[PDB]
């Protein structure tokens, strides 16, 4: 029955929304926040209020709006403004009070209550009591509580509650016992009274039921003395666990206050004060801390801080920093740490080791703040570098373990290196210089390398960043002995597991010319070969078949080395990859692209030297003889013609005729026509004709491409399915499918002519972002993530891509819907051209009209609608949407940092079972798309009309924007991890080719790209001088993504109207 109750609601929402579609009314808007709330969807409803605000300032009073937005702090100062200008007004006061009882401002709530007791209004007399009871509760004053409780009716759950508390204080336990049970029942009957359309009072019921059960434990804590440990444990655990907003925890602690004073709970209230600071409620955290110290809100401001309770002082100090007073905060630290090391070195008479330890770990935390604060106050320069390096080393001394400290020390050293290197490119822009430079850099490099090592071993699961950094120093430093020894040390020291994370980055430099670097790489790879080969074969096999000599040589060495222990694996892998490459682009498919290219150079460019270079690899390609039926069947129908078309070519090479060369093209154009006809006939490939070796394969020990991970039992290629559907396209990729040794099937897409190596790094980046999101509690609460797919490169030409089930391209879903509803697929386009035959050449202004014209005469539902019709129920429909909204927003931000261009409606798809969204084709990364000459993208990511429409009405204000901040906030917190990854492949040597396409050294261009990224992660993407906070930046972006001026400029294919 319960699962069926939300169904009718979800069903009503669909219509209630559809109504709003036709005419937005305050009526509907009311019955919308409510239904969205029964559906326990808080943030989507928060979006409805945003729209309610921006279109109807009509439940009025800016203080009433701040109150509904739970922004009590703004509503309180907005109510004061409204009170001092106006009069008494009995409603303005209640609001002014509600703000105080949320904020936990008992001092002002009790005062406001008594000091204003004319209250001739009798309803003003009823509410008044409830609040002023709890206010009196927080302020100790029990007399006041009793008075104000005597005015709360025992009919209300509230009135029954405060009696249980008054009794428990005065020690009347039978009274207290009954009052609880009455308060429960008066709350049970009340949750059915407002059966859904209520406040966060259904969520605050858990607050009252929590408190009532806790208040029964406070009962347990009064006469029978045996649970003082059992009770404190649950109280302690159901806290670190529990995640209830500041205000609720106040109340919960107030229950525990009846029995334990904060001075015995310490750890409890320190954690609570710790939460208040993190959720930016400082003035409250302060008051909790002042209480625990038992000393002034330091009104004695020039005095030193008390060291009575080392832990509390520390909190205070960081509260002071996070507060306004941060030179002051810094100052108290230096001095506190000094007091702390003396309080150790002297006061430690042996029979106190636990205290010494806990005192040494506190200091490490102090030193880390010290360095960190020093940096924030001064920056990085010849004077700070040594200080913070001392601060961090000091932190490293006092905790030894602790990732934070070793990390901090590593990064500081690493940034010392950077500081001088970037200071020296400053010098060289305008012999004893380099010798002192080499001394300088070497001085910080070695410890950086060292630091990153001890820090990596302290993560284990979470060290992609630190690991990548190790490689930066390792590759960048053309190797000085000192830095090498440090590396070798570390490599031995740290687990092999680690490096798997980073295999493509290592293989990137197999052929390093620096002899000291290669040796370590080659050795380290070999050892990774020893434990976890599999993790190594595919990527090595690729490398071993490479035009560049130094690569494939060095790759074979490690492969040879791997045969000494895993030979038949190496052998299987070798062949499977070989055969797949043959299958990817068949013989005629190559001759077709090679004949087009050959006729462009000759008949359209007069280039016979370049043309001969297009055909000669194709002729020698067949010179080897056919090896498959499909190769021989080609060799029949075409072989002799070609073998003699070359004969004429090689008569002209020596004769230099032009009639010799025209006999060749006479023959060449013959086979072209033949093949071109057969090309739309390839819609399936059969293994037995195309590659028999692959059909032959049974129970291999090679793993299913990109399924290997330790932890998980190895899944091997047990069989390859005999047929491959050829996806008839421009590149005609194959849809290969493999049978796994676990039973389950594994489908891939075998692509012939796209260097998959980029797509691989992007998936790496996504993986990290996925962890980051899984680790941020909010992002986890919401399930936020990027769906990724396996990317297994096979050559520079080809590779494999994981097939994602249940997906259709945006373009497909639409092609279907429009044909279903008898709408011409490309109608916005045909409208635009009817209006303006020369659309592409119009001025900006001219275009926006035509664009708007198209949009205004075509439906924007499609996607929204086809998703409704699809769904088997309405809760399934509702959820698929929630998933869709969120996942799209995730990739909007992530995609932005990546600079992910070219997001036309065939490059993103929607999973039809969860509704979550999926991006493919990562060819255009970093500003590339926007920098291009012809049709430059103006868009940061596609937030197009049908995508907007498909979310909830009140779209962008709701789930989308909220999720946008969340994701972005995570990305900014972890800006280095993200940049470690991104730096790794902007500067990757074999990957730099995708930016020299700005034509249609690189050292300088690569610098730009990465800055443009840091700019985005620091909120400096827009103006050079501002430093925009998240919601500003997000707003700016959504704006940009939505601008008609931007969209109308998009290459038509991009479908700026879908």
């Amino acid at each position: 029955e319960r699962a069926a109750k939300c169904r009718a609601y979800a069903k009503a929402l669909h219509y209630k929304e559809l109504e709003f579609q036709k005419g937005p009314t305050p009526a509907i808007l009311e019955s919308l926040i409510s239904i969205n709330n029964k559906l326990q969807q808080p943030e989507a409803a928060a979006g409805v209020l945003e729209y309610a605000m921006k279109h109807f300032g009509e439940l009025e009073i800016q203080a009433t709006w701040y109150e509904k937005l739970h922004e009590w702090e703004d509503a309180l100062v907005a109510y004061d403004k409204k009170m001092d200008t106006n009069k008494d007004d009995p409603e303005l006061m209640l609001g002014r009070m509600r703000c105080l009882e949320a904020l936990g401002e008992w001092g002002q709530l009790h005062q406001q209550c008594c000091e204003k007791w004319t209250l001739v209004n009798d309803e003003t007399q009823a509410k008044m009591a409830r609040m002023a009871a709890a206010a009196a509760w927080g302020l100790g004053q029990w007399d006041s509580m009793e008075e104000y409780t005597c005015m709360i009716p025992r009919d209300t759950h509230d009135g029954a509650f405060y009696r249980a508390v008054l009794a428990l204080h005065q020690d009347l336990f039978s009274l207290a016992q009954q009052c609880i049970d009455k308060a429960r029942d008066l709350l049970d009957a009340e949750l059915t009274a407002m059966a859904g359309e209520s406040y966060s009072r259904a969520y605050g019921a858990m607050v009252s039921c929590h408190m009532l059960s806790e208040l029964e434990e406070v009962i347990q804590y009064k006469l029978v003395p045996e649970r003082r440990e059992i009770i404190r444990q649950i109280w302690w655990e159901r806290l670190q666990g529990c995640q209830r907003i500041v205000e609720d925890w106040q109340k919960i602690l107030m229950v525990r206050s009846l029995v334990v004073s904060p001075h015995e709970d310490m750890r409890t209230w320190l954690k609570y004060a710790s939460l208040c600071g993190k959720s930016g409620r400082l003035a409250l955290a302060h008051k909790t801390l002042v209480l625990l110290l038992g000393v002034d809100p330091s009104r004695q401001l020039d005095h030193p801080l008390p060291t009575v309770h080392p832990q509390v002082t520390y909190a205070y100090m960081k509260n002071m920093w996070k507060s306004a007073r941060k030179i002051d905060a810094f100052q108290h630290m230096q001095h506190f740490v000094q007091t702390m090391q003396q309080q150790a070195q002297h006061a430690i008479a042996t029979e106190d080791q636990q205290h010494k330890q806990e005192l040494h770990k506190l200091m490490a935390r102090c030193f880390l703040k010290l360095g960190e604060w020093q940096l924030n106050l001064q920056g990085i320069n010849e004077s700070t570098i040594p200080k913070v390096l001392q601060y961090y080393s000091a932190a490293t001394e006092h905790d030894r373990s602790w990732y934070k400290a070793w990390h901090a020390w590593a990064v500081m050293n690493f940034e010392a290196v950077l500081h001088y290197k970037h200071q020296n490119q400053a010098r060289d822009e305008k012999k004893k210089v380099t010798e002192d430079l080499s001394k300088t850099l070497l001085m910080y490099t070695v410890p950086a390398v060292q630091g990153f090592f001890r820090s990596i071993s302290l993560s284990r699961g979470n060290n992609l960043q630190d690991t990548l950094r190790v490689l930066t120093l390792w590759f960048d430093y053309g190797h000085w002995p000192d830095v090498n020894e440090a590396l070798v040390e570390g490599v031995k020291a740290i687990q092999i597991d680690t490096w798997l994370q980073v295999i493509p980055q290592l293989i990137a430099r197999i052929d390093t010319p620096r002899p000291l670097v290669g040796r370590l790489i080659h050795q380290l790879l070999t050892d990774i070969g020893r434990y976890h080969p599999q993790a190594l074969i595919y990527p090595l096999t690729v490398a071993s078949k490479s035009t560049t000599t130094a690569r494939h040589n060095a790759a074979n060495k490690i492969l040879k080395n791997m045969c000494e222990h895993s030979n038949t694996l190496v052998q299987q892998a070798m062949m499977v990859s070989e055969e797949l490459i043959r299958v990817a682009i068949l013989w005629h498919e190559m001759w077709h692209e090679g004949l087009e290219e050959a006729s462009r150079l000759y008949f359209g460019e007069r280039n016979v030297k370049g043309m001969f270079e297009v055909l000669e690899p194709l002729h020698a390609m067949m010179e080897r003889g056919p090896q498959t039926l499909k190769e021989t069947s080609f060799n029949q129908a075409y072989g002799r013609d070609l073998m003699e078309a070359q004969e004429w070519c090689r008569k002209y090479m020596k004769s230099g005729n032009v009639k010799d060369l025209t006999q060749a093209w006479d023959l060449y154009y013959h086979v072209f026509r033949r093949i071109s006809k057969q090309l739309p006939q390839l819609t399936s490939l059969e293994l037995q004709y195309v590659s028999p070796k692959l059909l032959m394969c049974r129970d291999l020990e090679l793993a299913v491409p990109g399924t290997y991970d330790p932890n998980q039992p190895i899944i091997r290629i047990q069989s390859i399915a005999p047929s491959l559907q050829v996806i008839t396209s421009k590149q005609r990729p194959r849809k290969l499918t493999l049978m796994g040794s676990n039973g389950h099937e594994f489908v891939f897409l075998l692509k012939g002519h796209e260097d998959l190596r980029q797509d691989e790094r992007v998936m790496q980046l996504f993986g990290l972002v996925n962890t980051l999101l899984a680790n941020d509690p909010t992002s986890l609460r919401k399930n936020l993530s990027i769906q990724r797919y396996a990317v297994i490169p096979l050559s520079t030409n080809s590779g494999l891509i994981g097939w994602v089930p249940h997906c259709d391209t945006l373009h497909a879903l639409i092609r279907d819907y429009r044909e279903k509803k008898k709408i011409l697929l490309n109608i916005e386009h045909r409208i635009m051209l009817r209006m303006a035959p020369d659309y592409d050449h119009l001025t900006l202004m001219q275009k926006v009209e035509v664009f708007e014209h198209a949009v205004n005469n075509t439906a924007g539902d499609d996607l929204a609608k086809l998703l409704w019709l699809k769904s088997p129920s309405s809760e399934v429909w509702f959820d698929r949407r929630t998933n869709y909204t969120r996942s799209l927003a995730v990739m909007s931000m992530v995609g932005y940092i990546l600079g992910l261009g070219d997001r036309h409606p065939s490059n993103l798809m929607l999973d039809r079972l969860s509704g979550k969204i999926l991006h493919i084709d990562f060819g255009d990364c970093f500003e590339v798309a926007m920098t291009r000459e012809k049709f430059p993208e103006k868009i940061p990511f596609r937030l197009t009309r049908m995508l907007t429409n498909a979310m909830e009405v009140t779209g962008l204000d709701g789930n989308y924007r909220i999720t946008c901040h969340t994701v972005m906030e995570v990305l900014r917190e972890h800006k280095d991890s993200v940049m470690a990854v991104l730096e790794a492949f902007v500067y990757d040597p074999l990957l730099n080719w995708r930016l020299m396409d700005t034509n249609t050294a690189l050292n300088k261009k690569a610098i730009q790209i990465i800055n443009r990224v840091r700019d985005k992660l620091t909120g400096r993407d827009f103006s050079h001088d501002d430093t925009l906070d998240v919601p500003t930046q997000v707003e700016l972006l959504i704006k940009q993504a939505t601008s008609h001026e931007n969209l109308c400029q998009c290459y038509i294919g991009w479908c700026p109207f879908w």
Binding site: D838, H841, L842, T843, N857
Partner: protein, 317 residues
């Protein structure tokens, strides 16, 4: 066709420049203008030939030889040409381009090249010549208006509200007022300190008229200097009084029911010589002759298949 006292030219997306006889709505001649839409039309002060600024060219058809094709073409400039203007003394021509340049062309010599170039960051939408022939006013998409002294080559720039694109600018014959209109739909009016002849020529702000909610596309002073016209994407040409800066007369073409989705933008206007009448270019394929005082449609120039984005209107003896 230039021999008629009244020259009326209409150009747009349908590859023709049609000429009309003002008083009757009959289309006189029509000229082929293929490969591009027409961005601006201006008739030379000499009444000999009309200029058609388009995409990467300014073609110039002859009003006297009553028949042929472009006398002169100008080329070798990439992206659109948005504004044209002529200097009284027969020989100079000015242009604003998407290529971010204000160019001065010598009509009495050869060269696809232009005599001068004034480059800005961000594309130029409008270019107009102060009646003193000594200064060019140039509005760009960043929102900067540039006064470019044609003598000192001294550039001086002024931005109003902008981070917003200024769409057109104009300056009354008596050089007392300068106006500029932008994409927000605002209209800015400045007072003109007639420095001139050993020049200063200063701009003093007077009002910002909230002329439109949507894009404002052109602005123009009557010969009178009595009125200021403002064409917009809200399908409206609003005529403002210069004494008041209040709304005298609204000309509009917007359905008569909210469920129509518009049909047509008010792309351009030109006043008649006597400031009594006003011509109107719209995207609904028509030019229109209005009576400035009544706001009465006195004629409708039907002909163009596709949109109309241009007018030129001439009254000289």
């Amino acid at each position: 066709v230039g021999s008629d006292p009244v020259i009326l030219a209409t150009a747009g997306y349908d590859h023709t420049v049609r000429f009309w006889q003002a008083h009757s709505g009959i289309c006189t001649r029509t000229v082929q203008h293929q490969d591009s839409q027409v961005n601006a039309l201006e008739v030379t002060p000499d009444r000999s030939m009309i200029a058609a600024a388009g995409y990467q060219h300014i073609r110039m058809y002859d009003l006297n030889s009553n028949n042929p094709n472009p006398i002169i073409s100008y080329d070798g400039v990439n992206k659109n040409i948005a504004s044209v203007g002529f200097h009284e003394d027969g020989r100079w021509m000015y242009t604003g381009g998407e290529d971010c340049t204000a160019r001065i062309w010598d009509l009495r010599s050869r060269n696809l090249q232009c005599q001068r170039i004034f480059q800005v960051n961000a594309p130029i939408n409008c270019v107009c010549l102060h009646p003193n022939q000594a200064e060019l006013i140039v509005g760009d998409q960043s929102g900067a208006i540039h006064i470019w002294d044609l003598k000192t080559d001294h550039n001086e720039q002024l931005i109003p509200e902008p981070e917003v694109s200024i769409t057109s600018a104009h300056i009354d014959p008596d050089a007392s007022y300068m106006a500029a209109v932008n994409s927000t739909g605002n209209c800015y009016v400045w007072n003109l300190t007639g420095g001139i002849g050993d020049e200063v020529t200063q701009l003093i702000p007077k009002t910002k008229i909230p002329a439109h909610t949507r894009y404002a596309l052109q602005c123009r002073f009557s010969p009178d200097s009595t009125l200021l016209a403002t064409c917009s994407a809200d399908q409206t040409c609003k005529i403002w009084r210069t004494s008041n800066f209040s709304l005298m007369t609204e000309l509009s073409i917007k359905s008569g029911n909210p469920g129509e989705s518009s049909r047509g933008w008010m792309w351009g206007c030109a006043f008649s010589g006597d400031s009594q009448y006003i011509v109107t270019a719209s995207s609904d394929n028509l030019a229109r002759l209005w009576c400035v005082e009544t706001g009465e449609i006195k004629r409708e120039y039907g002909g163009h298949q596709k949109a109309v984005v241009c007018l030129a209107f001439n009254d000289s003896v």
